[PDB]
Symmetry: C2
Subunit: 426 residues, 2 copies
């Protein structure tokens, strides 16, 4: 087959493809359909992912036994804005994980990593805002400002405007950060133009009573970008003098990259909180299709997410490092970011003050936003005392104090012991 | 939780008759140590109120790995600007966080129902194949097959060769579309290529005396870029701007990209490209949603035409082209919501197209695949004319072989594909 010959070259060296700065590389788990040879199916994938039948994509590496295929994409395949000469993720996705996901000769193919060379990477927006901007608002250090105590209000959807605002007020007496639940917006039982003014008033009340600054992440997701812009402007107008303290929450997996670029390019001076609801449909290890969480979370930095949800890391630090450092390793590719702004990890899926010190030891820092369910609403006293116990668990860790010794001086952290007694170490 | 988020005593028919519930039907298998109704209820919670508007498991078939949930309509998000529905909300509630739950091995959406009060809040299509029939001078009802292509190779042609292949195709064919990644690549910049494509279309119109149709890729991250591309393309097509379709890569760019086209360019056929959809809609996937559910959703968003491929998935065709249709689980009335046109990738030669038509009941479709066009021994033009002839012959119900004499392009298809119907 001349298709196999034209669209593969196993003699190309990865090192030299990287050195040329002329190629986007992607690594995939691929398995052919029974009867198709690995190299023929791979070359066919490279063809379907580029020219069809020199801007041809090339299979440069196969491991038939490991079900591993590696493809070099000449940079000039990728689409460029007519308005500003910048890159679009939509083009990266359509070539490298587009048509190639419907091919009859392939049982499955999943992107595990990619490499973007400097001349292409620098054409992406990258983030304009991150946790540094939140540290600045809170009056914490601009380097290693540490842990931001956040929550979702429970119940997650269904609270009328007034009970929502009252629960937010109660939380902000102790915690830093509240996010809308990702579906939360302008539902008939809690309209946006009723709820948002009461949340802004709740935030001011908690600020007046504590003398501390607070943070809110408002859902602006919609289909119509005019509606995302209307939501964004209404929220900033409503928060008024506190408008700088509002993050914009975007469901960028189900709404897609265009919704995310809408927030990034219309509201660059606001923290862009990327919510990934629905991502598991492809990123689950149970799926052999689409792309991994690692690939997803790396692309969100390119889009300019200020913070990205990354989960619990086993309670996965490699994903955090790839978004928060200038120089990082994927499972297959080393990536230099050339000072593209970090995206902040936002951790979720429970976690309580007793297990926080081990989470920080593994990560090597606590420069993260935590939207903790169990950790705050499981505290015996109050969700506010729960958020204080979480910050105190960070402060204890940063000091290197002994948690139990630390508890003697810190009632909220002490009462965490009595809150989670079967977590609490003998 | 299980008690709160499930009620198996609820009757599907009364949920539909209330007009107060969106219903979703899913293939669901719990993790090994988890009971089926416990997992389903937990899924309903994660898909609604977590903890009036609690979503409810109303039906499980543990043996069939099947779970049906009722979603009170008031859960769904509404635009502040125009009081209209947004698909982003239906996706985040019905196939959102529920796709990352540790106590579920897999859950895939197989069908959904929208009651009339909520359905009518969606844009629906504003344009479909009827608008193309009008342009082509063909009947407004059952105007038949539109003969289409993608220029080969897929990507890589310079502007002048791309425009030349478009001119050559249009001498026999009706419709050309960008390949889905084709836009403003450096080797074929949009502002060089589109003017030459428009020129090629005018030359083909002048020599044939027939109208032609082009589908221009306007996909981008930035909605401002989608609008600049769409404006540049209408400006350049000038007097032929009515004959331009806007192609959006709606799966990889998402519903916000499609609404951008739908709401800024409602007067232009919105051609929905689904590159990457296979990552979830493949029968090999147990996650996300089926091609049926995907294609159903595109009609809501207002796709004028939707790629559906090429027997029983004409269950799909009926759901996008009719006012009244049945999914695998739910009957849906569209109450006059404009139909979405199937765009097929049907390779089939002029001699095999008939069996496709036979199975469909009609040839009211746009065809973009190349097998019957580029496989023709003479020219891609001749191949397009052969496929039209194969619709026209099948429509008139003439004898293929008797029709072949008097129709040289269909004739030469017999010599082009000596195997088949023999």
């Amino acid at each position: 087959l001349d298709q196999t010959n034209r669209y593969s070259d196993l003699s190309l060296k990865e090192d030299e493809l990287i050195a040329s700065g002329d190629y986007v590389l992607c690594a995939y788990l691929m398995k052919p359909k029974s009867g198709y040879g690995y190299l023929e199916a791979a070359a066919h994938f490279a063809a379907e992912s580029s020219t069809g039948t020199g801007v041809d994509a090339l299979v440069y590496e196969i491991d038939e036994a490991k079900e591993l295929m590696k493809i070099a994409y000449p940079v000039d395949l990728f689409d460029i804005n007519i308005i500003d000469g910048r890159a679009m993720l939509a083009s990266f996705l359509t070539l490298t994980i587009g048509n190639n996901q419907g091919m009859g000769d392939i049982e499955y193919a999943k992107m595990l990593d990619f490499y973007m060379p400097p001349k292409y990477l620098r054409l992406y927006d990258g983030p304009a805002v991150n946790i540094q901007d939140m540290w600045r608002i809170l009056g914490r250090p601009i380097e290693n400002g540490g842990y931001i105590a956040g929550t979702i209000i429970k119940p997650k959807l269904g609270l009328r405007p007034e009970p929502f605002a009252e629960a937010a007020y109660q939380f902000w007496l102790g915690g830093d950060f509240i996010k809308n639940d990702e579906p939360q917006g302008n539902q008939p039982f809690s309209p946006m133009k009723k709820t948002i003014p009461l949340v802004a008033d709740a935030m001011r009340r908690a600020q007046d009573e504590t003398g501390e600054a607070k943070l809110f992440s408002a859902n602006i997701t919609a289909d119509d970008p005019a509606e995302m812009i209307a939501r964004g402007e209404f929220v900033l107008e409503t928060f008024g003098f506190e408008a700088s303290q509002v993050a914009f929450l975007v469901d960028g997996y189900v709404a897609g990259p265009t919704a995310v670029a809408t927030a990034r390019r219309n509201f660059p001076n606001q923290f862009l909180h990327f919510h990934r609801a629905g991502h598991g449909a492809v990123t689950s290890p149970q799926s052999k299709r689409g792309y991994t969480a690692f690939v997803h979370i790396k692309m969100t930095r390119l889009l300019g997410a200020s913070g990205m949800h990354v989960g619990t890391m086993g309670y996965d630090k490699l994903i955090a490092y790839m978004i928060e450092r200038d120089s990082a390793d994927g499972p297959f590719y080393h990536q230099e970011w050339a000072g593209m702004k970090p995206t902040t990890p936002i951790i979720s899926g429970g976690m309580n003050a007793l297990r926080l010190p081990g989470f920080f030891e593994n990560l090597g820092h606590g420069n993260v936003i935590n939207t903790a369910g169990g950790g705050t609403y499981g505290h015996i006293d109050s969700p506010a005392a729960g958020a204080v116990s979480l910050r105190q668990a960070y402060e204890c860790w940063k000091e290197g104090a002994d948690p139990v010794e630390y508890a003697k001086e810190h009632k909220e952290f002490a009462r965490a012991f009595e809150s989670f007694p079967h977590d609490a170490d003998a």
